[PDB]
Write a protein that binds this ligand. Sequence first.
Ligand SMILES: O=S(=O)(O)c1ccc(O)c(O)c1
Ligand SMILES: O=S(=O)(O)c1ccc(O)c(O)c1
Ligand SMILES: [Ca+2]
Ligand SMILES: [Cl-]
Ligand SMILES: [Cl-]
Ligand SMILES: [Fe+2]
Ligand SMILES: [Fe+2]
Ligand SMILES: [Fe+2]
Ligand SMILES: [Fe+2]
Lengths: 359, 359, 354, 355
Amino acid sequence: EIPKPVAPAPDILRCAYAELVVTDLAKSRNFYVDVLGLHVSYEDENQIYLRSFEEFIHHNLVLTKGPVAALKAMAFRVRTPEDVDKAEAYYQELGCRTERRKDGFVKGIGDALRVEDPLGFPYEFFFETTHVERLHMRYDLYSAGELVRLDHFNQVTPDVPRGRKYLEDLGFRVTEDIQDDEGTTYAAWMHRKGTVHDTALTGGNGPRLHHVAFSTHEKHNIIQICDKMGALRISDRIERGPGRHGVSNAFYLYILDPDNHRIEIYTQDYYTGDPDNPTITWNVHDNQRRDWWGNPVVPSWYTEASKVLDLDGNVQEIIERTDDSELEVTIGADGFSFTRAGDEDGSYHGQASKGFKLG
Amino acid sequence: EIPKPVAPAPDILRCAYAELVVTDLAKSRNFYVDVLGLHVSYEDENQIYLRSFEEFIHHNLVLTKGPVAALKAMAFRVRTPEDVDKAEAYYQELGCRTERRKDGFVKGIGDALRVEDPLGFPYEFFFETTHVERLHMRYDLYSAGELVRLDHFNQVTPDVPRGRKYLEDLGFRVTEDIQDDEGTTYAAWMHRKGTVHDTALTGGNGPRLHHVAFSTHEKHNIIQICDKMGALRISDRIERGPGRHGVSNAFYLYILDPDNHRIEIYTQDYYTGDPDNPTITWNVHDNQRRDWWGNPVVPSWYTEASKVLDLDGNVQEIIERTDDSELEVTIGADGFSFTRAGDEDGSYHGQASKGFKLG
Amino acid sequence: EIPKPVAPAPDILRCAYAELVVTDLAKSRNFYVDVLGLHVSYEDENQIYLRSFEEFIHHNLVLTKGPVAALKAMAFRVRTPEDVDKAEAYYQELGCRTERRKDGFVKGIGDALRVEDPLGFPYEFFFETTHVERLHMRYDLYSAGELVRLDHFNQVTPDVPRGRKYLEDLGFRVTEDIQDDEGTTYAAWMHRKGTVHDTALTGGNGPRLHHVAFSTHEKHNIIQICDKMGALRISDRIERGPGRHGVSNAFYLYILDPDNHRIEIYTQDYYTGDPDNPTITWNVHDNQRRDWWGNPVVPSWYTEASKVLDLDGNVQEIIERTDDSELEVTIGADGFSFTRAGDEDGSYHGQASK
Amino acid sequence: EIPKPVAPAPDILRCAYAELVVTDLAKSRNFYVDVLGLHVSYEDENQIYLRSFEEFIHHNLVLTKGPVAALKAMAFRVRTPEDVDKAEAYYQELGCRTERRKDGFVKGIGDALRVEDPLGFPYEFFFETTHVERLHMRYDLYSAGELVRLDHFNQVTPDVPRGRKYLEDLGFRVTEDIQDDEGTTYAAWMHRKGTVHDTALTGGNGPRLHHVAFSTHEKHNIIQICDKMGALRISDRIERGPGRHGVSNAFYLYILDPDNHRIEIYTQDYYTGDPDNPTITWNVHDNQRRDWWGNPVVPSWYTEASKVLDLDGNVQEIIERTDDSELEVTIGADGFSFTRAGDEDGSYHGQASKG
Ligand SMILES: O=S(=O)(O)c1ccc(O)c(O)c1
Ligand SMILES: O=S(=O)(O)c1ccc(O)c(O)c1
Ligand SMILES: [Ca+2]
Ligand SMILES: [Cl-]
Ligand SMILES: [Cl-]
Ligand SMILES: [Fe+2]
Ligand SMILES: [Fe+2]
Ligand SMILES: [Fe+2]
Ligand SMILES: [Fe+2]
């Protein structure tokens, strides 16, 4: 277990941006700008800085050209300048490598701390950022599929309870989780900003980045993204969805960028800001937990995720999960799922729902 | 091959209602009224008469208690009383069994002709019907999933060109179809009322009734039906969808009633009323033809459909399709489909899209 | 009264396009293409040809540069080539001025008849048209405010019953109307294509064109048009709405183009294709008849409308309505409306609602 | 000016519920339950306890039968039980009348502090509340007009800067306001929970309660409320909207309950939780500031608002605003508004927009 430091945790506001390394900057720009409609704050031959419709900080996504596609940083904004100092002390007490840059790692961010966290993930904490034009009423620019906010990250890690405890000490509150009756946690969701989550842990080999998620206003905006991908004849880049989540109650879609980085589009989860917010636990065999309508979860969703980098820019080595696999226990050969607890009718033995099996 | 009569075709307005035989009237009522929110025009211990939100004729659906669940009649309204006489002469010239009842077969319909048509289907033609309160502005009744119109039927028949020719002579115009490069037709859609279809032919063993379809106003209304079925813990009765169709461009969902009769919910197809309306032909291997987003078509959608009755109430014998099977050529072990014609990337061989094979 | 010809009526499919004369083509292009997102089928220095998202015929709207903004033609598509001959014989029997151009009046239309109709309106009938790419699945082009179909026209004319009977003889069926207990007709809606209308008559001084209407898929698409006009700081060109109509039950918005031509955006009316489709008559004093939510109808909506041209391109003289005025009897000094009939609570006297 | 206490402010989470006094409990039930679809947590012959679709605390609205329709309490939830102690100390230092009940004033709330605040409003602060079934996935119950959350209160007060300073000291952050070029403030919006607001101040004679606001998921849910009101032939209880707000950017509707308490339905404002969230100031003459589409604001929206009670349950006396009136300066006989700053075209003199 990861000890609770004596040093106070930084006051984290929210997820703020991700830096993704991409192999072909022009192909990635086509995806995030021409397909998805994100707004360009800055670009050059090496990077593209993108933001959502309602954002006022400099960016929500930095695309950085490099040799190996990977997550380079997942950044959280803290409440005050002094919280960056607290972050450095906190992670130092945890025994983690840290790097501090007074003028930032990326453009439009000031004083910033990056850390190799105890789960092997590159976290950034910052307060200072260049404000830009907030585009929230620029309906002259608004797309039929407009991405309005950055909502969350989702991380793949082999030991969910170990990670959960560490994030709770850092001040994240768990809103929902998936467990079974034999003591295994498969996934947990945790927040600072008062939505279902700012980050989440998914059980699996890791550290890897499962996805970054953006919000829309309405469900039809997500439908439009699907429709547009069909018109562009890139429906093969729709991985899973659209659907209604069980966990989070959000309407959702997962798509894959040119380096196979997974992006979720998400809308209409619920308020979690009260400190005694009720924590919802789903059983791993409940076939409504991930897709409320019971649609099967494609195997790539469980197996595939992005590499993450260390502070030197090298790929983090992957540690195998030894706990039970959500894929295996639900849709694998000895898997099981139910529609109604205790009812054989609507249950699935050794295959996925709706008439499918693993490819 | 079905000859064109010398007798003039009746002028058909639209699909108007279906009579479905159901085995447990109370369970069927729970589904169509309590789950789906259709409006009761009349009911007793033997039948329930149901209509959509915007309908003014007596009903769109009659549920008739009987021993064997089946389609008993699919009914089309004709333009004038005289058109019922025309239908009788037309089908008599075709050599079909007919039955005329001056006071109707079901309540709220007057002079009506039922026929066992050349494809083995029980068609009804009528003009006279009892008008009811049109509920189109009854927003005090309006459900979050409100079904607003009857849109179409879909019929399974072994020889699609044979049926298509016959329906063309009856005045239906083909709007879309699905073919391969070697001259096999897998499906066709055809209309009278100026939408994509009033009925459609799906290649397969038949006669069987594939589905009846109702419309909603908006896409979110279809989403709500899915959400409600999740809340009722009957997500196992969601068969396929929700999705965007390729053919028709409509947003859709398929669900299964207590006797496994398939119901489609459908919205936002396009106007076809001009006589030179451009026909659209899709290749059977195009993985965007049925679901525009590339989501896989569940095998049950290809294989399962309702029995139909003859005019005595006995089940019609099934005749096997000898032309190629859409299931087998697209998602079976020797099947294939593409995202982009000629492109290996985004193509699927011997399995369905998105990472599944047949269960 | 307009006699019924012995000559058979042309079989009219639907409203198909309008040709509007505009005074500044570039300003009009900015409104219809950059603001509203219509799709260009052809343009040059004199004209812009535009179509909606789901259209396959050449255009739904022709903008033609000219000295005086006006309606130049409201065009209906007919079922067959021979229906253009029928239209010519029909209007000739009516005594109307007609002009036939075997190669069309505008690009992308072939053999076409224009008439000065008995109500003074420039109608076109055509079958032949150049097919174009139907954009209905081009979601890469789809706007948050996308206009998907041309739905209808609305005509201002002084005597509604006279016009109604003429249109019924042409095969249009009345779906809804507004009347009072004294027997005055204020407005009527009538169709060929199986929606609430292809054209409509509004009682007033005419001939004038009240509006041209386009459809969207959903209500949020109409909202987005309003939001976009706010962002462009042209909210003064939102005239009325957004709202729910009583008549038609459609969700709606009215906006004004740079020459003050009124454009309605409209969605989700009901099917009318059965020949005994029930006709709905509203009372003129029912404050839910025009806006179901009881929002007031601004006077400009009743009084302002576009000039129309004759076949020479000159402005048609206007005839004053002598029947009672809907404006005067509902929101004028001696007017009134109710929310619930017979209830003084929620009634309005000598003023509009809200 | 209201002094800043030495005593630390309580940590306020969010607006949580309002207690409204109503005259005919059955008629109010029909409005809030049958028309609007709120969910009953508890009822008897004296009170109805209602909650929104996504709520887990006991209620968002309490309807209490009484002789005079009024706001009895606007309640904010605080972060810990100790924050109720902090609230008590804070308001006592301000010289405000307070009353603390360890077992609450209404059912489903535990230890609670009510105060007559420096602006004359009845505030409640509480932590302890009875959890109930969260209905957020009960799509078997979901209405086409479903109200999903409580969003905010709006208060009418004569001196907006005075109130703004007091609320800032209490930890609310101003997100948007309306001012003119002559030093007058007409309205301010301020938050704790990271939306545009938990409460707002509207300049006018006060203390009165302008409205209570509930959220929907989507814009069509608000349109449905309007459509249903038309079908019920009660469209005369739609006061203003539906519309898009300028301030807040939310889609909105205002309707009137049987005692004329004003309810707003609201959706799709933006995130404000960062502490340097950019403040937006509108000019009072900007005709897109309240309705972005330029639709006129009816005079009743400016003039009418609910009485509020003191801790003894008596109506607070109304103090007259002496600052300029937003009604008068925009839509009165000497009013002015503009569509485009500096453009005579689309401007309005001595009247409201749209004719
Ligand atoms: O699945 S398809 O796109 O082929 C299709 C299109 C329209 C329908 O009504 C249908 O049932 C099926
Ligand atoms: O305002 S009305 O409800 O009378 C009306 C209904 C349908 C229309 O298309 C229209 O322009 C006007
Ligand atoms: Ca177990
Ligand atoms: Cl999931
Ligand atoms: Cl406002
Ligand atoms: Fe996620
Ligand atoms: Fe269908
Ligand atoms: Fe209209
Ligand atoms: Fe408000």
